[PDB]
Amino acid sequence: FRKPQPFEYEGTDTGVVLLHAYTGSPNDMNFMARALQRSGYGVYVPLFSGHGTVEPLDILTKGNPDIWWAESSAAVAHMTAKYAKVFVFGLSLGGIFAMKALETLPGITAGGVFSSPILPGKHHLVPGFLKYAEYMNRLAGKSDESTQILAYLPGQLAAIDQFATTVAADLNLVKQPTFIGQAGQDELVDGRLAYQLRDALINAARVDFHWYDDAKHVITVNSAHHALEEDVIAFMQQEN
Ligand SMILES: [Cl-]
Numbered sequence: 304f305r306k307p308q309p310f311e312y313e314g315t316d317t318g319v320v321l322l323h324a325y326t327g328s329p330n331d332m333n334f335m336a337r338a339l340q341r342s343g344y345g346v347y348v349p350l351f352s353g354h355g356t357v358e359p360l361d362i363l364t365k366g367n368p369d370i371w372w373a374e375s376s377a378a379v380a381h382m383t384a385k386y387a388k389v390f391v392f393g394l395s396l397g398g399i400f401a402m403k404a405l406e407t408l409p410g411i412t413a414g415g416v417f418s419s420p421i422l423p424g425k426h427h428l429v430p431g432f433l434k435y436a437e438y439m440n441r442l443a444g445k446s447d448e449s450t451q452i453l454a455y456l457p458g459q460l461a462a463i464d465q466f467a468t469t470v471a472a473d474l475n476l477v478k479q480p481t482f483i484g485q486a487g488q489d490e491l492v493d494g495r496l497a498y499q500l501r502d503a504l505i506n507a508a509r510v511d512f513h514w515y516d517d518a519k520h521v522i523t524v525n526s527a528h529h530a531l532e533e534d535v536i537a538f539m540q541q542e543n
Contacts, residue, residue, distance in 0.1 A: 304442055307355045312336060314345025317412075317539070318386035320378045320404075321348045322397025324521070325428070325463065326362060326435045328355040331394050335523045338532035344539070345386055349378040351396075357443045359436040363455035368399075368466035375400035376408060383410040390539055392482065394523050395419050395492065399467050406476040413542045415482030415511070417531065418489060418520050420496030422471050422503075423464040427491050432456055474503040481507045482538045484515065484522055484531050491520040511538045 307328040319339055323331040329348040336346040351374055353366030375397075382389045391414035393401030398419020405414050436452055481504050485497040497512075504510050513534050518527035 304357045307350065309350045310336070310348050312340045312344075312346040314343060314386065316386060317343075317388040317390070317543070318345035318347065318382040319539075320375075320382050320389065320391045320401075321346060322375055322378070322391070322393035322400050323348070323351060323354070324394045325396035326354070326359075326432060327394065327396070327521075331397075331521065331523055333524075334528045335392075335532060335535070338536070342536050345382070347378055347382050349374055357439055357445075359432070359439050360448060360451060360455075363452065363459055367459070368462050371396070372400055372403065372466070375404060379404050379408050379411065388412045388543070390414050390542075392417060392535065393419060395520070396463065399463070399470055402474070402477070402481075403470045405479050405481065406470065406473045411479060413480040413482070413538070415484070415538075416497075416500070417484045417522050418486045418492060418494075420485070420492060420494070421467055421474070421500050422496045423467055424493040424496045426493060428460055429456060431491055471503070474500070475506055477504055477507045479507065480509045480511065480538070480542045482511045482513075482535060484513045484534065486518045486520050486522050486525075486527065487514050487516040488518060489520045511541075 307330045321332040332348045339346050352370045353362040391401045391404045394417040398416030401414050485494050501512050515527035519525050522531050
């Protein structure tokens with residue numbers, strides 16, 4: 304097994320922070336980070352605490368929304384110290400922190416979300432996590448940990464939602480141009496909520512909204528990724 308590590312690409316004028324998904328890793332952002340690199344952007348992809356190991360309990364017991372927020376904030380600061388302009392985007396979980404960054408952190412030009420409606424709703428993250436864990440056990444040749452997982456999973460998902468509702472209540476604070484990309488066949492989160500995110504951004508300079516018709520949740524990696532990369536780069540170039 305290869306532990307995915309955080310990674311960084313050097314740029315000149317503009318840098319981008321990319322924040323990964325729950326149960327994800329910097330691997331979530333390989334295609335995106337490279338697309339940005341080809342267009343001359345600096346890129347930074349941190350690893351959230353408890354992620355990127357062969358042991359799914361690490362996510363539940365070594366990470367939490369508060370730690371991941373601190374890590375997101377540090378990542379932004381790392382990039383704003385170096386580049387004239389900084390954009391911040393996040394996939395699903397990462398999107399929550401991306402939006403909080405726009406709301407509360409200084410020195411950010413623009414940013415937004417990939418399949419991250421922010422507003423909590425019906426989701427399939429419980430089956431998602433369990434399927435992920437099962438696959439991780441399969442690679443590790445380790446016995447099933449579902450019972451141990453279920454002691455923590457509902458609590459951690461509640462904690463994520465709790466963090467998210469504060470971000471949602473603060474959406475009025477966003478002044479920056481905001482990008483919203485959403486999977487149209489999203490099996491993990493309620494895509495409909497992305498419209499409510501759009502409508503809540505009442506003070507954003509602009510809202511650039513994209514719907515990826517046939518795409519599953521992970522639009523940074525699946526069939527939608529070329530389109531998403533184009534749309535994100537177009538967004539950034541518009542706000543240069
Ligand atoms: Cl997620």
